[PDB]
C-alpha cells in the first residue's frame, strides 16, 4: 500500500497473509474454513496466516493453518487477469474471535463514489521498494467504469473495477495482491493489478467480487 496508514494490530480481522515460506499475497476470510484471494496468487504449499499484524514477529493472536485445497476460477485468464479470483480451503477451521473474523460477501454491487478500505503488506513506495512488517491500510473510492476504461484502454472487463486516485500517490501495490477491498462491511474487491503503483492516471484495478457470489457459495457448499 502506497500513501496509506498503519491500520493498527488486528483492526482488519478478515485480512489474511498467504505464506509459502514468506508472505506473498493477501486474502480475505469469508467463513471459518475458506479464504478468497486472487487467482494470480495461486501456488501449491500455501499456509494461511490469520490474526497477523507484524508478519515477521509472533505477537500472540496468530493462527497458522495450511491449505487443503485451492480452486482457481474456472474462467481465469492469466494473460488478461479476467476472473482473477480463487478460493482456498483451510485444513482445519479457524477459531473465530474479535481479531480473526470473516467478512460478509456483497448482496449487490457497489457504486462508483463509495469509499472502501484496501489493506495489505505490499510495497509502500511508488518508485523503489520498501516492504512493511505491519499491516497498511488505504481509504479509497470506487471510480466510474468510464474513467476506469479510459485509464486502461482495451483492458477493463465487466469483472473489474478501478478504485483510488487519478492524481496518483495512493494505491495498492506488489504484495497486496489477493487482499481485500471492503465497502460498508462487504467484500467488494480483490487487489488484482495496475500499471506500476500510485501512478497518475493509473488507478488500481480490482476483481469485482459481487459477480462471483453465486460461484463462491456453490463452490463452498460442495467442497
Ligand atoms: Ca505476527
Q: Report whether 62 belongs to an annotated binding site.
A: yes
Angle at 37 between CA 33 and CA 39, to 5 degrees: 125
Half-sphere exposure of 151 (CA within 13 A, CB side): 26
Q: Report whether 175 belongs to an annotated binding site.
A: yes
Report CA(73)–ligand 1 centroid distance (Å): 30
Residue 111, sorted as left (phi over 0), alpha (psi -120 to 50) or beta, turns out to be: beta
Element (H, E) at 218: helix 213-221
Q: Dig out the grid coordinates for 181 from the structure.
A: 477491498
3-state secondary structure of 140: strand
Residue whose C-alpha cell reads 521498494 in the numeric block = 129
Report CA(163)–ligand 1 centroid distance (Å): 29
27 φ, ψ to 5°? -170, 175
Element (H, E) at 146: helix 145-151
- Verify whether residue 40 is a known catalytic residue: yes
Of 189, 188, 223, which is closest to residue 205 (Cα–Cα)?
A: 189
Q: Report whether 47 belongs to an annotated binding site.
A: no
CB 207 within 8 A of CB 201: no
User: How many CB atoms within 10 Å of residue 104?
Assistant: 12
Instruction: Give 37's DSSP letter.
Output: E
Catalytic residue among 17, 23, 28, 40: 40
Catalytic residue among 17, 37, 70, 84: 84
Q: Report whether 127 belongs to an annotated binding site.
A: no
3-state secondary structure of 69: strand
Report CA(6)–ligand 1 centroid distance (Å): 15
Instruction: Evaluate the CA torsion angle 103, 1, 177, 210 in order and state its sign.
Output: positive
Pairing mode, strands 47-50 and 15-19:
antiparallel
Element (H, E) at 48: strand 47-50
CB 130 within 8 A of CB 163: no
- Verify whether residue 84 is a known catalytic residue: yes
| Sequence-ordered list of residues with C-beta below 8 angstroms from that of 65, at least 6 positions apart, any chain | 47, 48, 50, 90, 91, 92, 94
In the chain, the domains with their CATH numbers are: 1-12+103-210 (2.40.10.10), 13-102+211-222 (2.40.10.10)
Catalytic residue among 37, 102, 177, 192: 177
88/37 Cα distance (integer angstroms): 8
Report CA(64)–ligand 1 centroid distance (Å): 10
Of 28, 32, 34, 24, which is closest to residue 14 (Cα–Cα)?
A: 28
| Sequence-ordered list of residues with C-beta below 8 angstroms from that of 171, at least 6 positions apart, any chain | 1, 2, 3, 126, 138, 140, 164, 165, 194, 197, 198, 199, 203, 204
Q: What's the reported resolution, in angstroms, to a tenth?
A: 0.8
74 φ, ψ to 5°? -60, -20
What is 71-114 written as a DSSP string? Answer: EE-TT-BTTTTBT--EEEEESS----BTTB---BPPSS---TT-
- Verify whether residue 177 is a known catalytic residue: yes
Pairing mode, strands 86-90 and 34-37:
antiparallel
Q: Report whether 97 belongs to an annotated binding site.
A: no
Q: Report whether 171 belongs to an annotated binding site.
A: yes
Amino acid at each position: 500500500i502506497v500513501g496509506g496508514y498503519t491500520c493498527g494490530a488486528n483492526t482488519v480481522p478478515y485480512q489474511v497473509s498467504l505464506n509459502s515460506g514468506y508472505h506473498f499475497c493477501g486474502g480475505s476470510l469469508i467463513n471459518s474454513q475458506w479464504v478468497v484471494s486472487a487467482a494470480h496468487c495461486y501456488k501449491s504449499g500455501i499456509q494461511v496466516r490469520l490474526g497477523e499484524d507484524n508478519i515477521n514477529v509472533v505477537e500472540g493472536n496468530e493462527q497458522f493453518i495450511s491449505a487443503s485445497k485451492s480452486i482457481v476460477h474456472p474462467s481465469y485468464n492469466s494473460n488478461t487477469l479476467n476472473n482473477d479470483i480463487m478460493l482456498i480451503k483451510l485444513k482445519s477451521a479457524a477459531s473465530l474471535n474479535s481479531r480473526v473474523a470473516s467478512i460478509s460477501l456483497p448482496t449487490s454491487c457497489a457504486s462508483a463514489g463509495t469509499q472502501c478500505l484496501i489493506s495489505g503488506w505490499g510495497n509502500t513506495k511508488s518508485s523503489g521498494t520498501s516492504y512493511p512488517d505491519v499491516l497498511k491500510c488505504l481509504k479509497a473510492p470506487i471510480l466510474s467504469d468510464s474513467s476506469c476504461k479510459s485509464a486502461y484502454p482495451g483492458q477493463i472487463t465487466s469483472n473489474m473495477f478501478c478504485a483510488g486516485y487519478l492524481e496518483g500517490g495512493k494505491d495498492s501495490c506488489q504484495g497486496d495482491s489477493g487482499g481485500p477491498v471492503v465497502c460498508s462491511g462487504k467484500l467488494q474487491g480483490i487487489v488484482s493489478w495496475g500499471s506500476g503503483c500510485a501512478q497518475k492516471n493509473k488507478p488500481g484495478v480490482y476483481t469485482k467480487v459481487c459477480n462471483y457470489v453465486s460461484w463462491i457459495k456453490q463452490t463452498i457448499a460442495s467442497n
